[PDB]
Symmetry: C2
Subunit: 112 residues, 2 copies
């Protein structure tokens, strides 16, 4: 299970989603969004082994292509499979409008 539930417990390095709170202005400096200040963007870091929930067939082949060659950084790339929206509030000229960005959050990583 490579989601924000099994990665938000012990320590992990392979394809494990890690906390990635992003303060709209602190990290992205986004100026088109006023609120919220940030959110739990979460994300994924580190590659994955072979039986680590392989999505595509090239995910199991390369998974070994690296795990077999010591010194190769061509491993796979854990990524945010399922995402989540984001209730914000920005300004258009002079009228404030609250929306819900789509896929602006993570809820489970993977290995594409």
């Amino acid at each position: 299970a490579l989601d924000t539930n099994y990665c938000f417990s012990s320590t992990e390095k392979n394809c494990c989603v890690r906390q990635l709170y992003i303060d709209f202005r602190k990290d992205l400096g986004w100026k088109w969004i006023h609120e919220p200040k940030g959110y739990h963007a979460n994300f994924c870091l580190g590659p994955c082994p072979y039986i680590w929930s392989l999505d595509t067939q090239y995910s199991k082949v390369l998974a070994l292509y690296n795990q077999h060659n010591p010194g190769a950084s061509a491993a796979p790339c854990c990524v945010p499979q399922a995402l989540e929206p984001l209730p914000i509030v920005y300004y258009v000229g002079r009228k404030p409008k609250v929306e819900q960005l789509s896929n602006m959050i993570v809820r489970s990583c993977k290995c594409s």
Copy 2:
């Protein structure tokens, strides 16, 4: 265009698919497959900027979350979006059978 056409030309580091020929036995040591010896598995390496064909919304946000914080390796993860099959030939007990693995190749990366 982050495919094996624009990456197989000049040099790139961000989300650019690079050559990844894999010799079934040399790299994966796969013993369940006899032929071919290997194939053009290709793959992707390096993260991506913001306007680098973002797939999910978290691809444009994090793209800046890293491009903004100098010293953060939480960037995105370029991956093989479109893949390709693979005509092989293995053995089942004593009967040889040729098949076509699915998604056992890359034909274009992206940024999940």
